[PDB]
Design a protein around this ligand. Structure first.
Ligand SMILES: C=CC1=C(C)/C(=C\c2[nH]c(/C=C3N=C(/C=C4\NC(=O)C(C)=C4C=C)C(C)=C\3CCC(=O)O)c(CCC(=O)O)c2C)NC1=O
Ligand SMILES: C=CC1=C(C)/C(=C\c2[nH]c(/C=C3N=C(/C=C4\NC(=O)C(C)=C4C=C)C(C)=C\3CCC(=O)O)c(CCC(=O)O)c2C)NC1=O
Lengths: 457, 457
């Protein structure tokens, strides 16, 4: 069973069920049917039964021809074919994962997207990514152009803070709906297994939210005695908790393109529709390549950005060092608000201490803290939240230095699952918390301390 | 006719003939046939006659249906369909340019490429474009990878320098073949239209270089009294001159991917094969969009590069300026050999004259150069090449300043159309030319002069 307590540990990769807008058949390396969704018969007029092998006369030669090239293939398999089965024309998408072949039958409802038309989609959307040299212009723009394309009546962009928390930094919607810019959720709104997934799968599609799931039997793969891993499965089934959530938002359909930097989910575009919605495989696949592109483009942008700040910052220290080391008045050099140490780490208030002379730039909380490290008289460095009147406190020893950050920063069934609700349970974790001390800010205070360890007079 | 005097100005966009591995039907806005290749009967049943409209029984319904989307659609039309005609299976690729609709029927010879397969060709190659930061490594890799994908007996990357000239900076070949790395051809090897075209069309295909071509009648479009513009045409026929050339190179098939920055062809991938060779439209199409991606990547990658050198460059100047503006005897401040002038623009030797004092870094020539700006006694700047003992010469007045660059840089029917015969024709353009003075160098020597125009004592 799934509650607000079993939220973060839910194995959403191995649900043993799929959404109903298609059907699943799984097979072992030799083509034998190991399991299938319970709707096959309804959808397709086969009754795939374990031990069976599919035959032209239920699945068409186009499928088997396909699957064969999968069975006699060497690497990770992925492919698909647009066959017509008895009742309907189909998008049948296969792929092998672990040691299992999945055949997912998703219902095609269109004409054929020319191998060309497909391209101008991809190219039309990539085009947006390459106009801009600013990371936020980028998101703002593509966020628009995606809507013009899909028709999804809400499409947003999310950025993910280092704490894996989440913020809505771009949006385009149908006016009727409430706006979302600036909204913040917790890391806890997207579990490590969903996040892990979104990293693996560029694109996730929820066809209908209140869908009533369709199960695969056996729920467990006899060959392996483990359940079936449906990551990389298209009709894989969505966690109920997240289904409740979307409904509490008044949403019926979904889709998300991923953005990935490092090996991490840097953020994602999320598509919402007030009614059910289904983007075809082929289109999704224009977006899959979009995502690859987008992520790259965003990665090099961001490495350049921080590379820069990182430079502007270190050039500062080094400047400050020659200035102090080459003057005799260090108190006057070290505390000039422009040659100010405050210039070095991003803070609200700072402090130079050496001898019996102090200066509170931007003094009392300092009587206490030099009293805290009294039980630690061999520390040359100090750092903390959530703590007088300022919570951020970083302290380096040479004679001391201090940097501060105060933190003025900024129906249904379950307790938390809503927009303004996840932000209500976001806040209570962040009032103890000043803007956390960047991996860069410990390196700055550190280099600086050492740097002044140098001055002999 | 086409000779070496006449190759500069050739209209390769309007030949009035295509290549034989396909067929072409041009049609006006109401779909009436205005022209057709001469092999239309040879390749297909019909005799497409100006005036005629296509009928299902000539061309299939898939094409007629396609063309219909085109005739009623509004903007640039681009599209294809895979239809069986009488004799063969085809890739009918169509598009509209100016006010004409082209229907190219290129011979399909494979099984259908799935949308998925189409997608990882794309992503496989894109993936190669986003591992590296160095502009050079990037090229070096995709060069390799394209060979692993097409099989082209040769794969290469060209780079073009601001003087519209060309260098080969990446290779992957069948070893039996001479290696081209480090070769250099003039701008004259790719005429303005070639180049301008290579910018519009990302991709070009040549299947048999000794192909005896296929005309289209009427050579001239009644509606417009001007020839048909095959700019965007796939089967567009290639200049004879470039053919005579490739065969002198012993090459029967060719394929080019564009890399574009600014509105400018920054470089390209030329693929060569020593027997005839055709890469299917759908596959072409994946490279077409790779051309988009690679082009953007390199644009940012390169703009960071130049931006840096552009920053270190100006940083130096401004460094030197505060060091003299704030210092006392300038002949020596301008002249710690490291705070030196030569350390501000790329040269081989430089010179600082003022008063009656000279110092030849890296004096006599000084009395002669001031004697050649005697007939221009009010020149504060001077710049030249091809010229004493140096041909690159740039001069600034405040007392003067000079920077130097010497020049030790580095069958058929017509003479020059050969690899080493183009490189031989190249040397003449460069034997009396030093590395030209960049837009940047004229800005440095300028800002500097201005900077030293501030000094009073
Ligand atoms: C304003 C909107 C808003 C949302 C949507 C939010 C949480 C949130 N949960 C998400 C996915 C998800 N969230 C969950 C599970 C959970 N979901 C939970 O809220 C909790 C507490 C759990 C687990 C403890 C799952 C399983 C997914 C992805 C499911 C899938 O697509 O497979 C997503 C990503 C997909 C999307 O954008 O639609 C968000 C933004 N916080 C917000 O402020
Ligand atoms: C070692 C190899 C080498 C080459 C390939 C070269 C010139 C050269 N000519 C090119 C295209 C071309 N060159 C021409 C025409 C000319 N070509 C000429 O050399 C001249 C003198 C003219 C006309 C005055 C045309 C028309 C094309 C492109 C044709 C097309 O693809 O439509 C290309 C691009 C396509 C390719 O690389 O195959 C090159 C590199 N110089 C060299 O040293």
């Amino acid at each position: 069973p799934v509650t607000l307590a079993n939220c973060e540990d839910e194995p959403i990769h191995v649900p043993g069920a799929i959404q109903p807008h298609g059907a699943l058949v799984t097979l072992r390396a030799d083509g034998m049917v190991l399991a299938a969704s319970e709707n096959i018969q309804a959808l397709l007029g086969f009754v795939a039964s374990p031990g069976s092998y599919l035959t032209q006369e239920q699945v068409g030669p186009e499928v088997l021809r396909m699957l064969e090239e999968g069975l006699t293939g060497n690497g990770p398999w992925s492919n698909s074919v647009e066959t017509r089965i008895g009742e309907h024309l189909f998008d049948v998408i296969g792929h092998s994962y672990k040691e299992v072949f999945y055949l997912e039958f998703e219902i095609r409802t269109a004409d054929t997207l020319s191998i060309t038309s497909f391209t101008l989609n991809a190219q039309r959307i990539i085009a947006q990514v390459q106009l801009h040299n600013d990371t936020a212009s980028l998101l703002s723009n593509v966020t628009d152009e995606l809507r013009r394309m899909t028709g999804y009546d809400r499409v947003m962009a999310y950025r993910f803070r280092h704490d894996d928390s989440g913020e809505v930094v771009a949006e385009s919607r149908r006016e009727d709906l409430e706006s979302y810019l600036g909204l913040r959720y917790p890391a806890s709104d997207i579990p490590a297994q969903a996040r892990r997934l979104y990293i693996q799968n560029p694109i996730r599609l929820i066809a209908d939210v209140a869908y009533t799931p369709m199960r695969v039997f056996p729920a467990l793969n006899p060959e392996t005695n483990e359940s079936f891993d449906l990551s990389y499965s298209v009709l894989r089934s969505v966690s109920p908790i997240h289904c409740e959530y979307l409904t509490n938002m008044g949403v019926r359909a979904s889709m998300s393109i991923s953005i990935v930097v490092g090996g991490k989910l840097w953020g994602l575009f999320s598509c919402h529709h007030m009614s059910p919605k289904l983007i075809p495989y082929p289109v999704r696949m224009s977006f899959q390549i979009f995502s690859q592109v987008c992520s790259a483009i965003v990665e090099r942008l961001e490495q350049g950005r921080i590379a820069e700040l990182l430079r502007v910052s270190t050039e500062r220290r080094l400047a400050l060092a020659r200035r102090a080391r080459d003057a005799d008045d260090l108190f006057g050099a070290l505390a000039h608000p422009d040659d100010g140490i405050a210039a070095l780490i991003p803070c609200d208030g700072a402090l130079v201490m050496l001898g019996g002379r102090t200066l509170s730039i931007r003094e009392r909380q300092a009587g206490n803290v030099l009293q805290r490290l009294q039980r630690d008289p061999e520390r040359d460095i100090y750092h903390t939240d959530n703590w007088g009147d300022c919570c951020g406190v970083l302290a380096i020893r040479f004679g001391w230095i201090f940097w501060f950050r105060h933190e003025e920063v900024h129906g249904p069934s379950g307790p938390r699952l809503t927009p303004r609700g996840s932000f209500e349970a976001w806040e209570e974790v962040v009032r103890g918390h000043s803007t956390p001390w960047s991996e860069t800010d410990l390196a700055i205070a550190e280099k600086l301390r050492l740097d002044l360890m140098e001055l002999c007079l």
